[PDB]
Amino acid sequence: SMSYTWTGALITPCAAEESKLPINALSNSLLRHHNMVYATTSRSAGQRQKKVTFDRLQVLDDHYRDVLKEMKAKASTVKAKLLSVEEACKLTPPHSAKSKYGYGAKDVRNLSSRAVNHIHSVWKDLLEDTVTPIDTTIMAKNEVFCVQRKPARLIVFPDLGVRVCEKMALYDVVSTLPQVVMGSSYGFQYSPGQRVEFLVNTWKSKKNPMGFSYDTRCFDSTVTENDIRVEESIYQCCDLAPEARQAIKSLTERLYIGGPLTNSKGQNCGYRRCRASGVLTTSCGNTLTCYLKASAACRAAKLQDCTMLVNGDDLVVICESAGVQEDAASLRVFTEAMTRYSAPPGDPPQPEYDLELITSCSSNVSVAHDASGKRVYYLTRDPTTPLARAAWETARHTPVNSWLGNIIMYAPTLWARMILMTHFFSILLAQEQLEKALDCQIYGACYSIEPLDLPQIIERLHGLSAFSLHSYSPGEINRVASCLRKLGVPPLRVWRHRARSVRARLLSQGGRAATCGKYLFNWAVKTKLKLTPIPGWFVAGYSGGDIYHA
């Protein structure tokens, strides 16, 4: 079966698209090599269509079925509730795409009668009709990257009314089920701090540890009808209200399995037979399916004492080594199984005998030292993409503020502390916008966050040590420095100087601003201040699922 069929109608934009990095008075202070940064547009949609369009063959053995049975047995302990309309409505982002039927996200959020009435009619229709394919819109994503150009990713989503109904039927399910079924393997349950601790403990729990990342080529496209039905059977194991059972079944037959694709101008672009990127179940479904296939593949490959870590389509396995030669052999078998299960890798997996050499979700584990000299482990990444996006956000206001999300999730890193914190606090100070709440994304969910709350947020997510880390590793330092040269970003020494200024300016404002200066920029001073404590973020993945929290 083909992942997609196309009519030839173009994937069209819904507004003006910029590909070239916007430049303002602030731009050069962050980034000089402007031509290396770009944003994807609909212009490249055709190239992506080619990539994501292919035939899927599936061969399912006893290992696959054994694992599924186990997953279902755990799922049968889950009790999920129906969300009311009002509850579902409040989970809708303020700037979520408006309905084709004469209302928008704010109307939904305000419980306007027109909005509520349509939502009730969509719900009723889901209960009564389990066969009619539900329409979806296909769009090209506008995302920023550094050169070496990627084609635009595609997003596929149904109407607002349907999206609210998805929440009613499935929000509690996709929030609770994955942790019950996958236990400690479910990655979205951890803060970054908890994650690092889990990965370290897992690595140490093996006598002779070996690990590898496994990245499936175009995962969404590899997801077949079988997989989506199997996901449903898992959901249906839950203790559910009968109305919820019917809705979930209906949503599966009519939306999740597949459906027609309509562009922004209202033309039929073709047909989908794979995972929709823009539904509530995208994250949960991918996670379950990846876990199922991977666990089965571990058994097929005879890997000993396998621990899986799965979130969305991202996968890492840590297990007991059999030796360098046997390990390499076992991974080829693992890969053969995954491919049979329809998920071949983009890049072939490589066994690793050092935790820090494993990359997943663009991140790796690294080490610094805290105030006492004690080794602290933390999560970092290549800062190329964060810096590219920060540059864009310096000249343009965007729906999602990546810089803020990056500061939050990567607060312990040298690059986030020295560059991102310094640069953006400087900007906020000059505009006196320290107290203004900004929108950002954490594990696919949208949050409204006041920058002044950063120190408190960071202490909770990472611990007090985030504000005093030093003696970063040479490998990490060199990666950052090399990236800075590549993008024409000033060197870290300059950022130190700027941070002193920003710190002093924050302290002069007093109050919460002073606390930001004290904790966030303590690294900038020679004579450090003594840092003391300050008086459902990580439940599930929601990427593409139109979820919001205040």
Ligand X SMILES: CNC(=O)c1c(-c2ccc(F)cc2)oc2cc(N3C(=O)OC[C@@H]3c3ccc(B(O)O)c(F)c3)c(C3CC3)cc12
Interface residues with ligand X (CB under 6 A)?
187-188, 192, 195, 199, 211, 309-311, 314-316, 355, 358, 360-365, 379, 409-410, 443-444, 543
For 121, the 3-state DSSP assignment is helix
Q: Which residue has the tokens 């997510």?
A: 461
User: To the nearest whole angstrom, how small is the minimum distance from the Cβ of residue 22 to ligand X?
Assistant: 24
User: To the nearest whole angstrom, how small is the minimum distance from the Cβ of residue 350 to ligand X?
Assistant: 12
For ligand X, the closer of residues 99 and 311 by Cβ is 311
User: To the nearest whole angstrom, how small is the minimum distance from the Cβ of residue 361 to ligand X?
Assistant: 4
For ligand X, the closer of residues 211 and 285 by Cβ is 211
Closest CA to 141 of 127, 129, 155: 155
The dihedral built from the CA positions of residue 221, 225, 230 and 236, taken in this order, carries a sign that is positive
- In the chain, the amino acid numbered 170 is L
- Residue 181 in tokens: 């079924």
Distance of CA 244 to the CA centre of its chain: 27
For ligand X, the closer of residues 3 and 364 by Cβ is 364
For ligand X, the closer of residues 190 and 495 by Cβ is 190
DSSP state letters, 11-61: P--SS----BPP--TTHHHH-S-GGGEEE--GGGHHHHHHHH--B------
For ligand X, the closer of residues 68 and 416 by Cβ is 416
For ligand X, the closer of residues 139 and 290 by Cβ is 290
User: To the nearest whole angstrom, how small is the minimum distance from the Cβ of residue 283 to ligand X?
Assistant: 9
List, in sequence order, the alpha helices (H) in 341-436.
Answer: 384-395, 402-409, 414-415, 421-431
User: To the nearest whole angstrom, how small is the minimum distance from the Cβ of residue 542 to ligand X?
Assistant: 9
For ligand X, the closer of residues 83 and 355 by Cβ is 355
Residue nearest to ligand X (CB): 358
Q: Which residue has the tokens 């897992």?
A: 202
For ligand X, the closer of residues 161 and 544 by Cβ is 544
For ligand X, the closer of residues 40 and 263 by Cβ is 40
For ligand X, the closer of residues 413 and 426 by Cβ is 413
Q: Which residue has the tokens 């409505």?
A: 89
User: To the nearest whole angstrom, how small is the minimum distance from the Cβ of residue 460 to ligand X?
Assistant: 14
- Residue 486 in tokens: 């590549």
DSSP state letters, 31-45: -S-GGGEEE--GGGH
Closest CA to 83 of 44, 112, 123, 38: 123
Burial tier of 520 (Cβ tally within 10 Å: 0-12, 13-18, 19+)? buried
DSSP 216: B
User: To the nearest whole angstrom, how small is the minimum distance from the Cβ of residue 358 to ligand X?
Assistant: 3
User: To the nearest whole angstrom, how small is the minimum distance from the Cβ of residue 183 to ligand X?
Assistant: 14
For 396, the 3-state DSSP assignment is coil
Contact 319, 298 (CB under 8 A): yes
User: To the nearest whole angstrom, how small is the minimum distance from the Cβ of residue 408 to ligand X?
Assistant: 9
User: To the nearest whole angstrom, how small is the minimum distance from the Cβ of residue 356 to ligand X?
Assistant: 8
Contacts of 160 (CB under 8 A, 6+ apart): 92, 96, 97, 98, 99, 103, 104, 105, 108
Burial tier of 243 (Cβ tally within 10 Å: 0-12, 13-18, 19+)? middle
Q: Which residue has the tokens 């005998």?
A: 353
